[PDB]
Design an enzyme around this catalytic site. Structure first.
Site, PDB file in Angstrom:
ATOM      1  N   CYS A  32       1.113  -0.996   0.233  1.00 19.57           N
ATOM      2  CA  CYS A  32      -0.005   0.267  -0.073  1.00 19.57           C
ATOM      3  C   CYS A  32       1.129   1.404  -0.349  1.00 19.57           C
ATOM      4  CB  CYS A  32      -1.477   0.659   0.935  1.00 19.57           C
ATOM      5  SG  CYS A  32      -1.733   1.768   1.641  1.00 19.57           S
ATOM      6  N   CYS A  35      -0.789   3.556   3.422  1.00 24.68           N
ATOM      7  CA  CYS A  35      -0.521   3.033   4.621  1.00 24.68           C
ATOM      8  C   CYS A  35       0.666   3.442   5.206  1.00 24.68           C
ATOM      9  CB  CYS A  35      -0.841   1.851   4.286  1.00 24.68           C
ATOM     10  SG  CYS A  35      -2.506   2.175   4.555  1.00 24.68           S
TER      11      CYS A  35
END
Length: 105
Positions: A32, A35
């Site tokens: 990700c 994140c």
């Protein structure tokens, strides 16, 4: 400093070297982007708080440990002590980590 966890085996051994001091854990996602953009913040406490043990788990490489706490929302932070969970919370609020650290300090 910090320590990347590969599975639950290293997780247990990690709490062993911690002794009895506080032990936070950062459950984020490398695949990700957002994140992952919050990792320079958590890893920041590593040098700002040498009196705290910070770990780094990946729900993709260590999905075995993520299933333990059942983390279905990254990023997430957990507070462990003597191998006993005493507090935890989820949210992209890296700034809250400050008021949180003074919670179980």
């Amino acid at each position: 400093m910090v320590k990347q966890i590969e599975s639950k085996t290293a997780f247990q051994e990690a709490l062993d070297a911690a002794g009895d001091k506080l032990v936070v854990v950062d459950f984020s996602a490398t695949w990700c982007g957002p994140c992952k953009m919050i990792k320079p913040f958590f890893h920041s406490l590593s040098e700002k708080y040498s009196n705290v043990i910070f770990l780094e788990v990946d729900v993709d490489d260590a999905q075995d440990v993520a299933s333990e706490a059942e983390v279905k929302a990254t990023p997430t932070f957990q507070f462990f002590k003597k191998g006993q969970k005493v507090g935890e919370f989820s949210g992209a609020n890296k700034e809250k980590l400050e008021a949180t650290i003074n919670e179980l300090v």
